[PDB]
Every structure is written in structure tokens, then in C-alpha cells.
Write a protein that binds this ligand. Structure first.
Ligand SMILES: [Ca+2]
Ligand SMILES: [Ca+2]
Ligand SMILES: [Cl-]
Ligand SMILES: [Cl-]
Ligand SMILES: [Cl-]
Length: 338
């Protein structure tokens, strides 16, 4: 079949991980049920989305709740704490976080945007971060017909963001059929209070999304195409294609380093192991650094790679002052000397 061929191309089924080691990597105590996305502020506080659940993805603790965790990366051996969500505008029993993003106001108010999928429906929750009290003040729940199945967002103001949708459909049965057939109907939305538009479409599962430090480019990961799309971001928020980068791995969430502009990318080398879990054959981990992404030949380095004997299912990676923090879809988190 032509379909069985493109299926085992999309899920990269023949792929094995040549190890790339780091000598001082330590599992973060307290993270056992996922750390699928994370973001580090310029002051070294890192937010971690944890406990999220997906229909069909593995879970070691099904009654576990979704949590936003805090980590101070300026500490020597940093520990995670669960952030308290306060407010009355949000149903916490169904809180099921996925991608996250931050925005820092001119007053230095910190806003956290959190992709929420309570049930089959999909929202974006915006919180105010209260560092002293170590809490998240809920502000708003954002819902839209152009946000059917949000995977990750990148904030550009307190309720302004680009959002990936990893499926066109909302219903989980059609969702898996969509994903199995490879329709590639997932798309990217710009959301703002006064204006909500599709800015790109035709993606075979758009996952991570991020922005360059100067605002001029947007990066979008296409999981099952193994591609990172680079877009020019215009003053009217529309996007025009620029580069497409290709890899031998499923690219998941994208972090951008503020100083260099470098991309750090959490990857699933073999899509079968991450989608059809099997304890005797667990998914591995791979972290990519991407430099000089606008130039003729961009520099791609594998900074860390492993078959899962330590860390299973890396989905996000970010660096801070010599340290590398790696998160997983549903497993642990690895803190590493670079
Ligand atoms: Ca994110
Ligand atoms: Ca994901
Ligand atoms: Cl793997
Ligand atoms: Cl460049
Ligand atoms: Cl290995």
C-alpha cells in the first residue's frame, strides 16, 4: 500500500537512537506524571505543565491531576513546588494542561497562558503569576471555533497569542481517524480580543510553536511531517512562509533562547514508541539545538539522546545558565549540566 508506506514514514518506525550522553544529568524529584511543556523566565523561574492527559497516550497514574509546577533554576539542586490556582472563574476538577506560554507586561506583571483540554473541548486559560504568594490567579477562559484542538500557544500579549491545533476535529474518534489517515487539516490561529484568524494551514499535526526574541519570525513544529516551519511575522500579525527544516525525528515543543535566538527542540525519535506505549519498549528522548535558522545551512546539533532507560518521551527542552531542563509527555524530567 501507499498508505502503509506513508504511515511508517510519518511515525518514523525504523528509527533507533544513537546515544548522546551528558555526564551530570539528574531526574527532578517530584516529576513522575509528565512535564510536557515548560518555560523559563529571564530571572530563572521555570513553569512546568504536568499531569496533562491525552486520549490514547500512556499514563502511569490515571487519577493524577494536572498541575503547573514552579522551579527556581538559580538554586543549586532546584526543587519543584506545585503552584496554587486561586480564583473563582475556573473549574479546577477538570484542569488538564498542555502547552504553556508566558507574557511579561510593561509593569512586569507575569501572565501564564495554559492550553486546557477539559474533556473533549479545548480552551486557553490566562493566569496572573503571583511570585511572592507562589500562586496563579485565574483571569479568563478563552474559547473559539478557530481553537478546536489546541496543542501549544505562544503569547504576544495578555490575551494575544498564536495557537497550534494538532487536529482539525474535536471529537476524539474522528480525531484519531484524522491522524491515522494523515489528512493534515491542522492549522494555526492568531487570537486577540478584537481579531481571530487562521494564519497557516495544512499541517500534519502542528505541535510546538514559538517566536523569535525580536518578534519577526514564528516557528511551528509539524510533528508527523518531522518539520519545523519558519514564518515571517508581520505588523498585522499575519504570517508568510520562509523556510522549512526537515529532520529524522518527530519534533514536538519548541523553546527559543532569548540571548541567541537559538531553537531548543524536544523530539520523539520513533513515533510508534511514543504513541503506542509498551513498557518493554519505551520511547526515548532527543534534544536538538538549532542555530542560524535563516541562513543557507542551519546548524542542527543533537545535544542529548537516549533510548528511554532514564527519560522517556522528551517533549520540551530549554537551557538556562549552563543547565538543560528536559520535559516529557507523561514521564519524568531531566536536569542536566550542558
Ligand atoms: Ca509552549
Ligand atoms: Ca505534545
Ligand atoms: Cl524512541
Ligand atoms: Cl540566522
Ligand atoms: Cl541509550
Amino acid at each position: 500500500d501507499r498508505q502503509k508506506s506513508s504511515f511508517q514514514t510519518r511515525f518514523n518506525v525504523h528509527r533507533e537512537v544513537t546515544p548522546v550522553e551528558l555526564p551530570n544529568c539528574n531526574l527532578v524529584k517530584g516529576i513522575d506524571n509528565g512535564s510536557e511543556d515548560l518555560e523559563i523566565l529571564p530571572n530563572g523561574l521555570a513553569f512546568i505543565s504536568s499531569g496533562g492527559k491525552y486520549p490514547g497516550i500512556m499514563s502511569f497514574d490515571p487519577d493524577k491531576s494536572g498541575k503547573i509546577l514552579l522551579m527556581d533554576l538559580n538554586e543549586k539542586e532546584p526543587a519543584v513546588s506545585e503552584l496554587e490556582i486561586i480564583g473563582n472563574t475556573l473549574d479546577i476538577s477538570s484542569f488538564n494542561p498542555h502547552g504553556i506560554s508566558t507574557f511579561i507586561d510593561d509593569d512586569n506583571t507575569v501572565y501564564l497562558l495554559v492550553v486546557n483540554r477539559p474533556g473533549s473541548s479545548s480552551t486557553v486559560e490566562v493566569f496572573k503569576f503571583q511570585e511572592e504568594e507562589k500562586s496563579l490567579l485565574h483571569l479568563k477562559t478563552i474559547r473559539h471555533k478557530l481553537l478546536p484542538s489546541v496543542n501549544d500557544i505562544v503569547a504576544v500579549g495578555p490575551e494575544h497569542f498564536y495557537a497550534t491545533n494538532d487536529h482539525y476535529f474535536i471529537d476524539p474518534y474522528l480525531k484519531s481517524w484524522e491522524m491515522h489517515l494523515g489528512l493534515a487539516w491542522s492549522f494555526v490561529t492568531y487570537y486577540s480580543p478584537n481579531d481571530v484568524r487562521v494564519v497557516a494551514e495544512g499541517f500534519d499535526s502542528a505541535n510546538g510553536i514559538n517566536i523569535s526574541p525580536d518578534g519577526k519570525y514564528v516557528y511551528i513544529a509539524e510533528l508527523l511531517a518531522h518539520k519545523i516551519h519558519v514564518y515571517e511575522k508581520h505588523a498585522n500579525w499575519t504570517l508568510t512562509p520562509l523556510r522549512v527544516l526537515s529532520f529524522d525525528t518527530l519534533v514536538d515543543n519548541i523553546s527559543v533562547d532569548p540571548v541567541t535566538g537559538d531553537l531548543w527542540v524536544g523530539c520523539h525519535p520513533n513515533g510508534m514508541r511514543i504513541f503506542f506505549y509498551d513498557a518493554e519498549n519505551p520511547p526515548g528522548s532527543e534534544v536538538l539545538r538549532i542555530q542560524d535558522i535563516l541562513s543557507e545551512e542551519p546548524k542542527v546539533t543533537v545535544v542529548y539522546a537516549e533510548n528511554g532507560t532514564v527519560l522517556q518521551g522528551s517533549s520540551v527542552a530549554a537551557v538556562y545558565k549552563g543547565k538543560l531542563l528536559i520535559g516529557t509527555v507523561f514521564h519524568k524530567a531531566l536536569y542536566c549540566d550542558l
